[PDB]
Amino acid sequence: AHMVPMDKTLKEFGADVQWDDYAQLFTLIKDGAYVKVKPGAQTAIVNGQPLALQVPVVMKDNKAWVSDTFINDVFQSGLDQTFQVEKRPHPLNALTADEIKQAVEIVKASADFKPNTRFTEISLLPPDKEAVWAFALENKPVDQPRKADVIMLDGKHIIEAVVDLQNNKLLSWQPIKDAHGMVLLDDFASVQNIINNSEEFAAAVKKRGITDAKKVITTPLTVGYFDGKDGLKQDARLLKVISYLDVGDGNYWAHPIENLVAVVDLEQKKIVKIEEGPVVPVPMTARPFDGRDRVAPAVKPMQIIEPEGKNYTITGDMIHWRNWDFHLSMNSRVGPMISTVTYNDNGTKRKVMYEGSLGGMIVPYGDPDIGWYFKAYLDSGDYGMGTLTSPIARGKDAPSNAVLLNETIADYTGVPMEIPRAIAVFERYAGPEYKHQEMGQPNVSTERRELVVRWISTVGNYDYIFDWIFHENGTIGIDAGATGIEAVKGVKAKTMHDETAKDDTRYGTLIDHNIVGTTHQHIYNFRLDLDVDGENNSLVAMDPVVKPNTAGGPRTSTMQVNQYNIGNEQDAAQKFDPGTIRLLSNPNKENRMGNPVSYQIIPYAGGTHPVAKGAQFAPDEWIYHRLSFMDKQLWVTRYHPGERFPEGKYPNRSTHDTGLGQYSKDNESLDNTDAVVWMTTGTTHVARAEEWPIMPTEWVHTLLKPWNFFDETPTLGALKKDK
């Protein structure tokens, strides 16, 4: 049997391939492996180490060829140290394909299962956090058997079963009264068909100028709750259906059929209601965003390279990097989970964060017309953002020196799915860690490195990017970015000089002919179980104030700080003024100067869109009443195993706040106890032409800073002078 063409197989396999004709040297890059190899050479170089090749690379008539074994021999070499194998499995490891298939098999074996039964979530049910910490810090095995939460959708009915996988037995099976299921993948499909089979809807569509109809693209949206004012029965399973025309530019979003909404009952599998408003001609101009009508730029290359491999290690799901240690896993709803986060301080791992992850997000609009009044995406709770993860485009969505992880989750039928390139891990240069150039002395400066964990999820039209950023000095950043395609309203005006302009643009900017970028908000929320050098913490406020000078001298005022504790959940739920300081401290543990070891919580560290002061809804709005998390930037709640979502566990047609509103309502004491920090950061998005047909990536930042957690500059390095 013959050999295999080098360049060909390598691309298949996903490695970058560079040929240097002058040096006669290939350079092959893939994740932590940086490989050098010359034609006909004895050995290749992997991360700076020699690897024997029995079969040297071959150059024929300018075509290169390698062994059938080359990719494995080189890349799965072990000279790339990036990945190591976990000895004792971590108790928070996500369910395996096997474990998943098992949980599904356990439920299918109970009396009540039925074949239309879909799966909305199949996730590990973590052991109690204490056993989990003892594992991470003390290597104590966890005694409790691996269980899994299985949330089923039986038609429209939700049921929560719990399975024991160690013992292969079913533990719980309770129906959840009045709860609606999230949107599932087949739902998209049913809605396109039901609409395609609608005799009415084709006629509805025909009159709005269409022709064909095979060309109508639908998109499913949840209906929220309007105490019946929308005319929709509280206990049917429904979705409203917004439609666009497909014009062949690959961007149906650019051609709304405006003032046409259809309500579909998924159980019935038919259209129960059609709201029709004024006919507005469908905007027809081609607006591709993929570059089909564009000139490719020539750009000179830029390569971020790490030729001796990475400074992090990935053992199972454990990531070790400089002084950080943490566990990375995936959840179908909220995406990545970052757990058991410790910072190694001169030998001892100190607790920073037991579990951190997106909590939930919402993007709600502020137009009142039929196509828009109920329109509000709960991307994670309602559509499942983990499930909808978008594989990273190597080199573009993440820098060329990224390592990209694959992650496994159950699909909605309980069959395992591996998502390729689900999370990017990458170290990056982030300016000077610090510098001082004393006048007439040698300069002092060192470089800053952040380790970024990056995840992207696309829900319908928008794409959202999350970066969890680990500074070497102890600071942790969380940024959310938004890009993709705007939800636009069809309108009669071509320019602002047209007669309809003022009325068309009342609720958003006219971003293209006949196209308005309806104003709305982007609201993310992070649930951060920060255990600051321990479980029991308190929330401290420091408000800088200008106080009168009462100490003589020429000054009239001084800069002082009003420090006070925040002792309950109700006061902990607040607006964040970035001029103040909010600290989660450990009142049991002080640094060398006798200050309580803490972390400074900053829900607003800036962003590139204007910032929402709060929810852009009157207090009487139903969406306002069910989603408290929207109106406050900072919350802190007592820890409880079940409380995990800012929007509540079943937010679809919820009638009341079951999220942060619910968790803080019992107003528990936040003094010297296990806290959980929630940060809400929102923007108000008034659109502009620069953002159409594709919105350039826009960012918000949040930050978590060590505050007297340490004794000194954390990046000074190992001490020599004494101990």
Ranges within 571-600 binding a copy of itself (CB under 8 A): 577-581, 590-595
Say which entry of Ca ion, Zn ion, a copy of itself, none residue 561 contacts (CB below 5 to 8 A, set by partner kind). a copy of itself
Say which entry of Ca ion, Zn ion, a copy of itself, none residue 697 contacts (CB below 5 to 8 A, set by partner kind). a copy of itself
From the list 559, 641, 642, 723, which residue makes contact with a copy of itself (rule: CB under 8 A)?
559
- 24 or 144, CB closer to a copy of itself? 24
Compute the distance between CA of residue 677 and CA of residue 674 in angstroms, rounded to an integer. Answer: 10
Residue 442 binds a copy of itself, judged by CB under 8 A? yes
From the list 126, 414, 474, 603, which residue makes contact with a copy of itself (rule: CB under 8 A)?
474
Task: Report long-range pairs for 24-27 (Cβ below 8 Å, ≥24 apart).
Answer: 26/57, 26/64
- Are the C-beta atoms of 668 and 637 separated by less than 8 Å? yes
CB within 8 Å of 658: residues ≥ 6 apart: 626, 647, 648, 649, 650, 651
Compute the distance between CA of residue 199 and CA of residue 191 in angstroms, rounded to an integer. Answer: 14
- 46 or 330, CB closer to a copy of itself? 46
- Is residue 61 annotated as a catalytic residue, yes or no? no
Nearest 5°: phi and psi at 716? -60, -35
Say which entry of Ca ion, Zn ion, a copy of itself, none residue 668 contacts (CB below 5 to 8 A, set by partner kind). Ca ion
Among 343, 354, 462, 604, the active-site one is: 462
CA angle 603/609/614 to nearest 5° reads 50
- 529 or 647, CB closer to Ca ion? 529
Tokens of 572: 């902990």
Residue 87 binds a copy of itself, judged by CB under 8 A? no
From the list 317, 427, 479, 531, which residue makes contact with Ca ion (rule: CB under 5 A)?
531
- 315 or 608, CB closer to Zn ion? 608
Instruction: Please give the annotated binding residues, written as ranges.
Output: 377-388, 459-464, 520, 522, 529-531, 569, 663, 666, 668, 674-675, 685
Say which entry of a copy of itself, Zn ion, Ca ion, none residue 125 contacts (CB below 5 to 8 A, set by partner kind). none
Binding mask 591-630 for Ca ion (x = CB under 5 A): ----------------------------------------
Nearest 5°: phi and psi at 60? -95, -115
DSSP string computed for 606-660? -BSSPBPSS-SS-TT-HHHHH-GGGS-SEEEEE--TT---TT-S--TT-SS--SH
- Are the C-beta atoms of 338 and 326 separated by less than 8 Å? yes
Q: Per DSSP, what are the bridge partners of residue 50?
A: 45
Give the H/E segment covering residue 464: strand 462-471
- 91 or 607, CB closer to a copy of itself? 607
User: What is the footprint of Zn ion within residues 158-217 (CB under 5 A)?
Assistant: none
Binding mask 371-410 for a copy of itself (x = CB under 8 A): --xx-------------x-xx-x-xxxxxxx---------
Say which entry of Ca ion, a copy of itself, Zn ion, none residue 172 contacts (CB below 5 to 8 A, set by partner kind). none
3-state secondary structure of 131: helix
The terminus-to-terminus CA distance of the chain in angstroms comes to: 64
Cβ of residue 534: shortest distance to a copy of itself, in angstroms?
Answer: 18
CB within 8 Å of 650: residues ≥ 6 apart: 158, 176, 179, 180, 181, 182, 658
- Is residue 564 annotated as a catalytic residue, yes or no? no
Half-sphere exposure of 47 (CA within 13 A, CB side): 17
Residue 450 binds Ca ion, judged by CB under 5 A? no
Compute the distance between CA of residue 133 and CA of residue 151 in angstroms, rounded to an integer. Answer: 27
Tokens of 285: 């101009």
Residue 527 binds Ca ion, judged by CB under 5 A? no
Binding mask 636-665 for Ca ion (x = CB under 5 A): -xx------------------------x--
3-state SS of 216-271 is EEEEEECCCCCCCCCCCCCCCCEEEEEEEECCCCCCHHHCEEEEEEEEEECCCCEE
From the list 302, 347, 499, 641, which residue makes contact with a copy of itself (rule: CB under 8 A)?
302
Binding mask 653-692 for Zn ion (x = CB under 5 A): --------------------------------x-------
Instruction: Please give the annotated binding residues for Mn(2+), written as ranges.
Output: 529, 531, 674
Nearest 5°: phi and psi at 267? -65, -60
> How many other C-beta atoms lie within 10 A of the C-beta of residue 611?
15
3-state secondary structure of 694: coil
- Are the C-beta atoms of 123 and 331 separated by less than 8 Å? yes
Instruction: Please give the annotated binding residues for substrate, written as ranges.
Output: 377-388, 459-464
Contacts with a copy of itself: how many residues (CB under 8 A)? 179
Residue 612 binds a copy of itself, judged by CB under 8 A? yes
**Residue that the structure tokens 């757990």 belong to:** 339
- 163 or 636, CB closer to Ca ion? 636
Residue 529 binds Ca ion, judged by CB under 5 A? yes
User: What is the footprint of a copy of itself within residues 484-523 (CB under 8 A)?
Assistant: 484-485, 494-497, 501, 506-507, 509-513, 519-521
- Are the C-beta atoms of 34 and 306 separated by less than 8 Å? yes
Cβ of residue 487: shortest distance to Zn ion, in angstroms?
Answer: 8
Tokens of 174: 């309770």
> How many other C-beta atoms lie within 10 A of the C-beta of residue 128?
12
Residue 429 binds a copy of itself, judged by CB under 8 A? yes
Cβ of residue 592: shortest distance to a copy of itself, in angstroms?
Answer: 7
Cβ of residue 685: shortest distance to Zn ion, in angstroms?
Answer: 4
Contacts with Ca ion: how many residues (CB under 5 A)? 9
- 615 or 675, CB closer to Ca ion? 675
Residue 310 binds Ca ion, judged by CB under 5 A? no
**Residue that the structure tokens 């004792």 belong to:** 88
From the list 230, 411, 668, 698, which residue makes contact with Ca ion (rule: CB under 5 A)?
668
- Are the C-beta atoms of 448 and 492 separated by less than 8 Å? no
Active site (catalytic) residues: 379, 462
Give the residues lining the site for Ca ion (CB under 5 A): 529, 531, 637-638, 663, 666, 668, 674-675
Give the residues lining the site for Zn ion (CB under 5 A): 685
